[PDB]
Design a protein around this ligand. Structure first.
Ligand SMILES: [Mg+2]
Ligand SMILES: [Mg+2]
Ligand code: NA
Lengths: 752, 763
């Protein structure tokens, strides 16, 4: 297959000319990545930089100094010092990386976007691209040319604490928005990423979000068809768009740590996809091979196993001794020089693509005036608005009106930490209200929009301040419930903001998906006042709320909309904006009946032979794609041509969508398929395409979607792709159309 | 390359099979592959008019004589019947079969814990309880008794043992197997097969029956826990864990196997030629009879839509290796299979092999020479006290004392005992599903002569010392058992007044009976009413013995701290009340051990054989893994009224290779004051491996009875190849490097000195 990134002879000549000049010490140093802590005396230590970079030849540094967000100036002066030693002693520029994963996670003042789960709910490729383009600009303003993003793990277990870091439970959404994210970060030329753009990094390759138990970094048990058809597909898709780097899943599947899995790292990914990018470990995961999983007896053997499996750079991330042990591997014949040379070739190639040899630093004081601008914040607020899902709205309770006295209650009502979640200024997000109080909480934005005299704050339940480890992220407590109920009696409408406080990775593991008991009791007691309730779900995971949903006339899921989510929510609740978000996952009802939308027919209740109207409503609080608007949209006249088709065809799908209500609004248009009979029992529905359009009242538009016939193929039992003769249904809104594949096509190549 | 036949080659047997096959018409062949329930032979109108089971002789003549159907299954009216009622029915079936076909009918029943569907027979603990006994000999004796009492019905076949691994605590079929562990299900499945069939699979006499392993395979690992929803089993787990009990029990000569109704990796097992024909029949060289589960050929086209119609579904399943279709209602199966043959969708070679396997099974059971036999005279021990004694001992050995603070148990004379909770006075509660009816929902109505917990406690401690006041009550089941999960508060205040007057409260909580998909649950927690009951009882200040009476380990973490003693009785059957009363009185000593992990939290489910990365806080170079934060009680938990000390673990040879068999000796001493049994469990851990190694694996067990002060050496034999694992490529390997063996708190390091890589699919 053609190279994932275009062949460039001049680029390869620079790579090989530099490789030919390097000592073994310099080669192993390029493969070593350390965090900023070994360089920290925020004050850095010049002697530490000379040692780590000058003596040990370390080629990459990552992370926020002091593990907390810093200003662009603080990063710039630090990286200037790093680059001075790197160019003088090595002649190869350092590669600095940050986990800038919803805007500038680790840069104070930068534009903070909704988390990726929210962007999934926007179904909006261009808005996703615009956000990572803004993130790229604001990260280069720190002299940083690389983000470890996008995360495109499939969200396959609602208990997993990293549920909210990806674009949701669906393969196609993660593939398409992952591509849009890569394009926004990197721009349109992977071989020349200018100084407004940064290297992207897909993570965490792969199946990281399917742990059997839901606990982070515990084994998955992914089926043969699922591994290729679903978990691999977003990585394959975004590799095809030219991503410069990929980070490997820390965990384990079928007893095999991914960091030791040569078949998946080298064969499926680098070789099959002909991808010449740079493959980095996740944090300390070479250490994990011997300490955690005991597939190696010591660190030397762990390094050899990971590097031979295809790893190019180790996020060690603390010990310069990695370089000594890798040299021992080479000297003892455990790793061949061909593998070292190839790894360094990939690292150098990435550095050349970022322009770092010619510009290891650049004019950060002058060239980034839009950093943290209101113009950038407008895009974040739009993203936030388009992500919020109106799940229920009985009796036109929303939008709220002038005059109405509003009570804001719940532990998520007056907190920026709650709006942002984890990966915000600190890893756990546990200091956001302390570090960036200038941004607007839900309460502050509601008070500004509706008037201080109309908006009263009485939480009833509060979160404590996090300890340093954020060990108390799940804690909350009742706080003068009596006063809160009195305040509810005095109001016209209650906006109750419940869900989760912030957490990240394993510290956020949970043991029961239910919403916390105090927050359940709060909403039940508010309901007894007889006042109408707008239930706002503010959370990284879809915590169970089936016992309080019947009490709420309206329900809004804001997930984790970031610094501008309060502003956005106030505009939606006021009717300045119109809801258009749609759930990018299944919201479960019960702790031990978890399902996704793309389930098998045998899991349906009641479906009769020859029907395809499957029913999971007794198990699903709200389904994938749920969401309503303040206006109404009618779909009609679904057309598909050619209706008889084979693998070489492209299907042209057209659906008419009319705003039949009184408000302008956007509508995400989602196209599903179902294979009516198959040699592997067929998923009841699969999302195959989507678009999003804005319609004036009364306006009708034809939406056209192009669907290659091969997108109706599936991975059969033998692990190979096949498109089978037989019928399918395509679905758009409540419209459906039957089509027929006239001839079976079996692939012999690993990918279609 | 070929392994020896799983069942010994018998020239005379094959000659009988081939001579009979050569005489048969195509109609007779497809008839032999068709199995129907008793319902098409039941006169429905006259059954309802009289209330008694009535069969229709004209229906027998049609189904057997005209459509040549070769097997009938199930309890008439799907309700247990007397041996005499079965016998008259089967006599009528055999009369038509022998006259019109010349091939005896093969009748099958799901006799899965004693005689499920025979009134008056001996009902044993369910298999999950037998797992808890760690007692091969009791397991074997129970299925010998079941075989005897099933032959007394003129029935020569049970669809058992069930040896699914219990990998998901929410699965409603959790209690039908021997628990979550591979080795337990392998060993007790072999013991069960030996008990049912006896020691010669080619000549099963008239006190023994054909066994049937089910449900092949990975049936108990649905991702969501819901019955008949997809599993997603890893390549190493499928061969190492799910296949292994079937492999082991095939080597013990099982006559028949039934396939998993469900799906793994998108593939119905009933359409999976690789697993049915290649892994099983071919690789194991097994000449037995492979039967579908209920209506599962229909499921291929109706439920899973991997076939477009029943004809295509039949061809797929038969070509995949199915020999007999449990249709179970339509004689038209024979017409459709004949159509497959005439259209060339199924080759005659596959028909002739399937019929050969069915005929072979019929000859092994002696059915051509003896299609019926002297049921009136030859089974005088049916329902005897001798048989009941074995059921009561298996019930006793199954019950697990999980907590016993302050020597609350055993109870003593003079104590006024209150029995509370909705499981305190129910035979349905004691038996669970698959008892007299499929859902088990009529057992107190149908068999009131057996003793509930309350009845057995009152008889043992004195009627004047035992009081019943439940506080929470299960409703009577509707016909579909749609309300098995419901319960109701029942004048709690009066029960609390009764508790204040008692000296000790025995609170019996858990689940009512259910079976298969009707029993699916949505939250593992114990019901809210039963939680409230125990909390309100605890406020009286009286000591509570908490009795867990249930098919699944429902979460009880909020009430476990309130109970001074906790006993898990699982589903101990008709003699479980009697057994519990003996244990609580101290007539017997507790010896049961949990054969599964009891979870604490609904979204933190785990088994004992987990990976190191799942352990909390284990240091490099250490092997003392910890999951207590997530486990209410672990696999192997259980205490005794006495104490046992383990010492002097020794292994020889300690440096070994794959050809070696390790002799493992551990000394066990009763250091308390009461006689008791102790199950002795031997685990291993591979200290480093090319696939991350399970933290513990059970490799051997025994069970011994020790007087106070008595020490005994226990000797266990461990083939070196039992320490191999299925590597990432799906192949077995035993790698050079160190292992630890564990018994009690003792451990010993051993070293494999050379790697052995298997090229064959099995070791
Ligand atoms: Mg099809
Ligand atoms: Mg080893
Ligand atoms: Na009774």
């Amino acid at each position: 297959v053609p190279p994932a990134l275009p062949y460039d002879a001049a680029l390869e000549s620079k790579v090989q000319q530099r490789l030919a000049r390097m000592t073994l010490d310099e080669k192993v140093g390029q493969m070593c990545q350390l965090t900023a802590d070994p360089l920290t005396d925020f004050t850095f230590d010049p002697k530490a930089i000379e040692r780590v970079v000058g003596q040990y030849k370390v080629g990459s540094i990552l992370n926020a100094p002091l593990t907390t967000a810093q200003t662009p100036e603080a990063y710039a002066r630090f990286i200037e010092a790093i680059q001075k030693v790197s160019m003088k002693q090595i002649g190869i520029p350092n590669l600095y990386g940050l986990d800038q994963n919803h805007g500038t996670t680790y840069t104070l003042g930068g534009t903070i976007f909704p988390q990726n789960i929210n962007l999934g709910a926007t179904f909006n490729r261009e808005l996703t691209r615009r956000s990572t383009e803004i993130c790229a600009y604001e990260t280069r303003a720190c002299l940083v040319p690389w983000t470890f993003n996008p995360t495109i793990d499939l969200a396959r277990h609602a208990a997993w604490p990293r549920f909210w870091e990806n674009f949701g439970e669906d393969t196609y959404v993660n593939a398409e928005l992952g591509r849009a994210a890569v394009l926004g970060y990197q721009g349109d030329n992977p071989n020349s990423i200018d100084r407004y753009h940064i290297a992207a990094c897909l993570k965490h390759y792969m199946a990281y979000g399917a742990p059997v138990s839901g606990r982070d970094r515990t084994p998955s048990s992914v089926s043969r068809s699922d591994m290729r058809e679903k978990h691999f597909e977003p990585f394959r898709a975004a590799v095809q768009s030219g991503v410069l780097s990929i980070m490997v899943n820390s965990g384990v599947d079928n007893g095999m740590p991914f960091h030791a899995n040569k078949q998946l790292l080298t064969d499926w990914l680098k070789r099959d996809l002909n991808w010449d990018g740079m493959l980095v470990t996740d944090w300390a995961d070479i250490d994990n091979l011997y300490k955690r999983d005991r597939v190696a007896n010591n660190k030397k053997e762990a390094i050899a196993m990971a590097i031979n499996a295809g790893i190019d750079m180790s996020m060690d991330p603390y010990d310069v001794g990695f370089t000594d042990l890798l040299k021992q591997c080479v000297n003892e014949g455990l790793v061949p020089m061909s593998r070292i040379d190839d790894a360094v070739s990939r690292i150098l190639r990435m550095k050349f693509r970022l322009g770092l040899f010619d510009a290891p630093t650049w004019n950060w004081r002058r060239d980034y005036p839009l950093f943290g601008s209101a113009q950038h914040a407008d895009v974040a607020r739009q993203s936030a608005e388009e992500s919020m899902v109106l799940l229920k709205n009985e009796g036109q309770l929303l939008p709220l009106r002038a005059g109405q006295k509003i009570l804001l209650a719940g532990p998520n009502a007056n907190s920026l930490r709650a709006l942002n979640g984890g990966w915000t200024y600190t890893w756990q997000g546990h200091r956001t209200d302390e570090l960036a109080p200038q941004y607007k909480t839900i309460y502050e934005a509601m008070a500004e929009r509706f008037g201080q005299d109309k908006v009263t704050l009485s939480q009833g339940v509060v979160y404590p301040k996090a300890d340093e480890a954020n060990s108390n992220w799940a804690a909350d407590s009742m706080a003068d419930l009596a006063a809160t109920l009195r305040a509810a009696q005095a109001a016209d409408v209650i906006v109750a903001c419940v869900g989760e406080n912030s957490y990240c990775e394993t510290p956020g593991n949970l043991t029961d998906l239910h919403l916390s008991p105090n927050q359940r009791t709060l909403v039940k007691e508010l309901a007894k006042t007889g006042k109408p309730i707008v239930l706002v779900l503010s959370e990284g995971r879809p915590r169970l709320v089936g016992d309080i949903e019947p009490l709420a006339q309206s329900v809004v899921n804001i997930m984790l909309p970031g610094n501008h989510g309060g502003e956005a929510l106030a505009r939606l609740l006021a009717g300045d904006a119109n809801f258009s978000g749609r759930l990018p996952f299944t919201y479960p009802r019960f702790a031990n009946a978890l399902t996704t939308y793309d389930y098998k027919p045998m899991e349906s209740v009641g479906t009769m032979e020859g029907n395809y109207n499957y029913d999971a409503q007794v198990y699903v609080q709200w389904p994938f794609g749920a969401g309503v608007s303040y206006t109404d949209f009618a779909y009609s006249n679904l057309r598909v041509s050619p209706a008889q088709f084979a693998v070489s065809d492209t299907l042209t799908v057209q659906i008419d969508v009319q705003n039949i209500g009184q408000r302008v609004g956007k509508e995400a248009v989602l196209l599903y398929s179902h294979d009516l009979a198959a040699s592997s029992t067929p998923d009841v529905r699969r999302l195959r395409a989507f678009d999003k359009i804005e319609l004036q009242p009364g306006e009708k538009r034809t939406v056209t979607l192009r669907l290659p016939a091969a997108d109706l193929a599936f991975v059969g039992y033998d692990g190979k792709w096949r498109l089978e003769a037989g019928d399918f249904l395509l679905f758009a809104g409540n419209q459906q159309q039957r089509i027929s594949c006239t001839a079976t096509h079996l692939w012999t190549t690993p990918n279609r």
